[PDB]
């Protein structure tokens with residue numbers, strides 16, 4: 001009745017076995033060096049921490065080569081429709097120079113498969129930004145969510161929007177991302193994909209509904225989502241195909257690197273790359289700590 005489990009990602013090596021580790025140059029052109037599973041384990045970038053799954057970055061060595069070492073995991077399995085529930089004890093902090101993201105990417109050529117940014121932000125951001133990226137012909141309505149809509153056109157080249165800004169909604173809770181999120185011991189992000197739209201709920205630690213982690217969660221009875229992407233201005237079924245889950249932490253690049261000098265991180269260094277390269281200790285908080293990752297289907 002409602003939803004049923006299709007995949008419990010487990011923890012540790014069993015969890016890592018369900019992902020492919022991306023090691024190519026960063027598609028978002030950041031100052032990052034994505035390493036293999038073996039190199040990551042050898043550098044302490046991945047592992048298990050008291051039953052929870054850890055994924056972080058190099059906060060020890062001055063960077064060299066492509067950039068600061070990190071990992072990008074992309075799930076082996078993909079999902080058409082469903083409910084993605086992640087319980088995090090910790091997420092990458094609001095650290096200057098960083099650009100963490102837990103998101104989904106459709107199959108096929110970009111951007112026809114669509115993409116969903118569930119948890120994403122840059123540098124010293126306070127609020128989480130939930131965003132969709134699609135081909136042309138997809139805009140969203142203004143109701144059904146607690147967050148504040150920033151952009152309404154999901155097309156990667158929407159007319160007056162920055163390139164690939166997509167259609168984003170900003171959370172109103174300062175504990176929805178980074179520093180605040182970690183200070184309260186994290187929380188739960190549930191993402192629902194249907195042929196009529198996408199919804200994302202953020203439940204700060206201890207405020208989650210009693211069935212969110214169980215066998216049959218029912219979003220219909222949950223409080224208002226933080227972000228809802230729906231409306232007749234988009235063919236929801238056609239704009240998104242099978243999605244794979246992705247975890248990553250990049251540095252500088254297209255977004256973080258370009259807004260480095262405009263925000264509160266500007267005074268830290270002349271530029272993002274210099275900061276990330278010479279201040280390894282600043283990235284200790286840039287890690288994911290997963291309590292559980294479960295995917296359900298209608």
Ligand SMILES: OC[C@H]1O[C@@H](O[C@H]2[C@H](O)[C@@H](O)[C@H](O[C@@H]3[C@@H](O)[C@@H](O)O[C@H](CO)[C@H]3O)O[C@@H]2CO)[C@H](O)[C@@H](O)[C@@H]1O
Nearest residue numbers: 027028099100101102103105110115116117120133164
């Ligand atoms: O166009 C050249 C490459 O595109 C790759 O697709 C990328 C896309 O280019 C990139 O902008 C996008 O970045 C993601 C954001 O859209 C959003 O979803 O947030 C993500 C997390 O921060 C961010 O990475 O990612 C797309 C998928 O990697 C093609 O994959 C690549 O083959 C092609 O050369």
Ligand SMILES: OC[C@H]1O[C@@H](O[C@H]2[C@H](O)[C@@H](O)[C@H](O[C@@H]3[C@@H](O)[C@H](O)O[C@H](CO)[C@H]3O)O[C@@H]2CO)[C@H](O)[C@@H](O)[C@@H]1O
Nearest residue numbers: 131150151162163164165166168253254255256258259
């Ligand atoms: O290209 C040089 C030019 O960059 C401007 O900064 C842009 C950057 O180029 C864009 O790629 C970036 O876009 C972000 C998206 O990639 C992201 O997915 O979503 C965010 C959120 O709304 C987008 O901002 O935006 C920045 C800032 O507009 C510099 O401003 C400009 O001076 C420089 O010449």
